[PDB]
Design a protein around this ligand. Structure first.
Ligand SMILES: [Ca+2]
Length: 223
């Protein structure tokens, strides 16, 4: 996250870290046994880390649970990033409380102008690299589809939205991928892609979760 603030320990209780020996992506806990992330975060051998603030220090609220199954969306296209969404089933159910909690799926899509919370452990610089150990947060609005398509001609599908600031300076970045965009207490987006981070006229692009609720519910019900 570039241009954000330190969230505070366990203030984003649905935020997960995906770990394969090191943090490589975020995700969101949607019930006691399932995490949603980006398809471009797929790899084998994922451990899901819940209850994290500092990802390099054991602070006492962590739960580390291995993945038993990963399901990339059937229509994911790695070249265009269309349908950039993946479900991960945990080997055992997480223990839910105030510091580890699920986030609700949306019943309707959010409109442009809605303010959302984006969070992650990704790079905090737009030029150069500095990775934080504690969770960073950013409040950002959903942008109109016309502004999003004007920023990224020929690249925005109906399964994507832009959020952030056309003036630059505040954005998600490398290592935030797969993490949550939460608006009015519902998961509306997944950190997906962008051209660089926090550049002028290049806001972040996010997977539009409301288009996937039927697929998520049907998949969880049968796996
Ligand atoms: Ca920790």
């Amino acid at each position: 996250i570039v241009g954000g603030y330190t969230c505070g320990a366990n203030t984003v209780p649905y935020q997960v870290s995906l770990n394969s020996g090191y943090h490589f992506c975020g995700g969101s806990l949607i019930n006691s046994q399932w995490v949603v992330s980006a398809a471009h975060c797929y790899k084998s051998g994922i451990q899901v880390r819940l209850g994290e603030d500092n990802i390099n220090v054991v602070e006492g609220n962590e739960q580390f649970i291995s993945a038993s199954k990963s399901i990339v969306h059937p229509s994911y296209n790695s070249n265009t990033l269309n349908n950039d969404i993946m479900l991960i089933k945990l080997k055992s159910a997480a223990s839910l409380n105030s510091r580890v909690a699920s986030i609700s799926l949306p019943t309707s899509c959010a409109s442009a102008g809605t303010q959302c919370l984006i969070s992650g452990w990704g790079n905090t610089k737009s030029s150069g690299t500095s990775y934080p150990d504690v969770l960073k947060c950013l409040k950002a609005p959903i942008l109109s589809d016309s502004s999003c398509k004007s920023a990224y001609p020929g690249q925005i599908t109906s399964n994507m939205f832009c959020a952030g600031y056309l003036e630059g300076g505040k954005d998600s970045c490398q290592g935030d991928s797969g993490g949550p965009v939460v608006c009015s207490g519902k998961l509306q987006g997944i950190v997906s892609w962008g051209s660089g981070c926090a550049q002028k006229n290049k806001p972040g692009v996010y997977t539009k979760v409301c288009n996937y609720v039927s697929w998520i519910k049907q998949t969880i019900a049968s796996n």
